[PDB]
Amino acid sequence: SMEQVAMELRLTELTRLLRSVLDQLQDKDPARIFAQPVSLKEVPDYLDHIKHPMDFATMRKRLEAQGYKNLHEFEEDFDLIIDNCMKYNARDTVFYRAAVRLRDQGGVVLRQARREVDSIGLE
Numbered sequence: 300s301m302e303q304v305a306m307e308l309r310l311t312e313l314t315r316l317l318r319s320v321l322d323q324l325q326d327k328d329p330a331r332i333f334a335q336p337v338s339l340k341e342v343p344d345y346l347d348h349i350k351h352p353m354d355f356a357t358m359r360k361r362l363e364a365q366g367y368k369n370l371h372e373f374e375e376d377f378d379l380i381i382d383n384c385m386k387y388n389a390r391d392t393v394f395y396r397a398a399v400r401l402r403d404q405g406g407v408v409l410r411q412a413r414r415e416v417d418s419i420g421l422e
């Protein structure tokens with residue numbers, strides 16, 4: 300139906316916008332600490348601690364499959380990256396501090412992304 304096509308166009312446009320947002324957020328992680336899943340070979344106890352791992356590569360996979368239906372779902376995964384790190388790692392670590400900086404700088408981007416999703420009407 301034409302209606303389903305129109306909805307698919309909206310999703311495609313949302314995916315385009317979120318791809319831009321993802322690129323901007325990842326630029327706030329120049330150390331690439333959050334680029335890939337935490338290695339279960341190198342951190343074998345990780346899943347005992349963290350029940351829902353997340354990372355930028357995993358987000359990108361879901362994004363390209365158009366698996367984010369709204370900005371809230373995207374934000375949930377971004378928050379997982381930050382929140383998982385701030386639990387597993389102590390305050391005095393380069394990991395925890397990288398997460399704090401990513402959260403703070405990312406907030407700016409996500410603030411204007413919300414305005415754009417609402418304005419253009421991509422949900």
Ligand SMILES: Cn1c(=O)ccc2cc(N)ccc21
Pocket residue numbers: 332333337342383384387388394
């Ligand atoms: C425990 N942990 C994190 O929480 C986030 C990123 C990370 C990266 C490496 N290379 C090793 C461990 C890590």
